[PDB]
Design a protein around this ligand. Structure first.
Ligand code: FAD
Ligand code: FAD
Ligand code: 0TX
Ligand code: 0TX
Ligand code: ZN
Ligand code: ZN
Lengths: 230, 230
């Protein structure tokens, strides 16, 4: 026991469907006795841009700015902007990181993309070498809880939008697995705007109910076959 | 001729490999007699976050904030923030939109993700019923010019990262095709940091040379089969 959870939450509106899914996760994980922290990115005005302001120390090469190189070195020297290290502390302490967001352009909203870009730097989240199964966040779990405009039917193989797993690839594999996370099955709450209020309440209750047994779940095999099939 | 091009450019450093690819595109398209415009997102300090500041008027619903609905209505009511409408004007005038960026987490840097989120609103880029082949930007061409850290071999179907086409799906299909663009084959400049000077020169020259005949190209079939098939 004694599990720690970080929820990285990306919605502007506390009364939103995303807000309800975040709150029910806080409620249920709290009820279980888990330690819970939420990064409410919009409320934090979280900075999404990868810039030279993210390093406060002497640059390795002040004539030609290479974000990856400079953040790697800043991580090692401890000269990263404090907003980044504040998030790194939350990740370091977490056993499970839940990302709660509406799908924007088959991906995460930009503010959350910026969290990934800025927080998961070399030295902290991965090394070269030291990625995928050797990533530095090994031993941790991650889970994408996503809401969509499109219906489940629209996000199937035979639909023009394609199977929902297709768009998970850059997030689950390219990012989370790359950093060493084991990835729990995504929670996709399809088309709440189209849904009836009863169907919406059902989707929120389904997430809460799933969370009751989250610590017993196995991760997915985060492979091309899982995402794309044969 | 009389062709118009917008380059949406996302790199912090003018002397970067991305910078050089952007500059060669400007040079070669300018030489051809094309009309060329560049949105240098980092130099513009482009806002990535989707917030209620993106609507200038009174909100469609001041009590509960729905970004998609509010921006749709704002577009119809000419009440979007000027940074967004400035970009929409550039897109509206363009026959070809080139995106020039380094791959960040199998996707675009957050600043460019924010451009997509905030600029391509419903009513402007898509609507009911105009999407995929009938998207509102139909008749326009789009092209992703991406640079990577990983090698071409890492980006193979059975390589650690999977086929590069796998990460293109959310961008080419879920975003560009969705908005009605015809998608020209991506330009992928693999691993310039690792490449020799000569190899880098070759990749820049390949891009310059490609641009010489860009108006003669057929778009790819932006399908699941192209992205995921044998
Ligand atoms: C920039 C942008 C890009 C997008 N790109 C995509 C894309 O690529 N693919 C795609 O499929 N969609 C896309 N969308 C649509 C988007 O994913 C949906 O709009 C979003 O997922 C809806 O979630 P929400 O929390 O905002 O819904 P909400 O509008 O907040 O929720 C709907 C309703 O649920 C109600 N509600 C809240 N809590 C509860 C509760 N506890 N019980 C019952 N009802 C409740 C709310 O009052 C509301 O009426 C995009 C949208 C934007 C703005
Ligand atoms: C947050 C983050 C996430 C990332 N995620 C990924 C990922 O998911 N997958 C992946 O594969 N990579 C990833 N990367 C790596 C990234 O994609 C590469 O670092 C980037 O593409 C390199 O391009 P660049 O323009 O910055 O190269 P640069 O470092 O600017 O350039 C490389 C070399 O080319 C030289 N050069 C510039 N112009 C010319 C010229 N005209 N002729 C010859 N040489 C020239 C430069 O001087 C330099 O020496 C990530 C990086 C970051 C920071
Ligand atoms: C017209 C607005 N309103 C009236 C019913 C319906 C809500 C709008 C719906 C949910 N939004 C969407 C539904 C489905 N797909 C989408 C893809 C993108 Cl990129 C953006 C928005 C999307
Ligand atoms: C000083 C040496 N310097 C090159 C300038 C280090 C370059 C490291 C290499 C290129 N970067 C990378 C190579 C391959 N994959 C990657 C995935 C991510 Cl997320 C981030 C960086 C990556
Ligand atoms: Zn994986
Ligand atoms: Zn397509």
């Amino acid at each position: 026991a004694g599990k720690k959870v970080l929820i990285v939450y990306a919605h502007q509106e506390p009364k939103s469907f995303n807000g309800s899914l975040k709150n029910v996760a806080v409620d249920e994980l709290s009820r279980q006795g888990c330690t819970v922290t939420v990064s409410d990115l919009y409320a934090m005005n979280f900075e999404p841009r990868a810039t030279d302001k993210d390093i406060t120390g002497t640059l390795s090469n002040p004539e030609v700015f290479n974000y990856g190189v400079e953040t790697h070195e800043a991580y090692k020297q401890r000269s990263l902007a404090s907003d980044i290290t504040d998030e790194q502390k939350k990740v370091r302490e977490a056993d499970l990181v839940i990302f709660q967001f509406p799908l924007y352009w088959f991906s995460v909203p930009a503010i959350l993309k910026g969290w990934m870009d800025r927080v998961l730097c070399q030295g902290f989240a991965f090394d070269i070498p030291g990625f995928y199964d050797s990533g530095l966040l090994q031993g941790k779990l991650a889970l994408l809880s996503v809401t969509t405009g499109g219906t489940a039917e629209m996000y199937t193989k035979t639909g023009v939008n394609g199977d929902s797993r297709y768009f998970l690839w850059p997030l689950q594999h390219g990012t989370l697995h790359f950093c060493g996370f084991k990835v729990l099955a995504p929670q996709i709450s399809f088309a709440p705007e189209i849904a009836s209020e009863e169907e919406r309440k059902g989707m929120v209750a389904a997430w809460s109910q799933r969370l009751q047994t989250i610590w017993k779940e196995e991760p997915i095999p985060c492979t091309a076959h899982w995402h794309f099939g044969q």
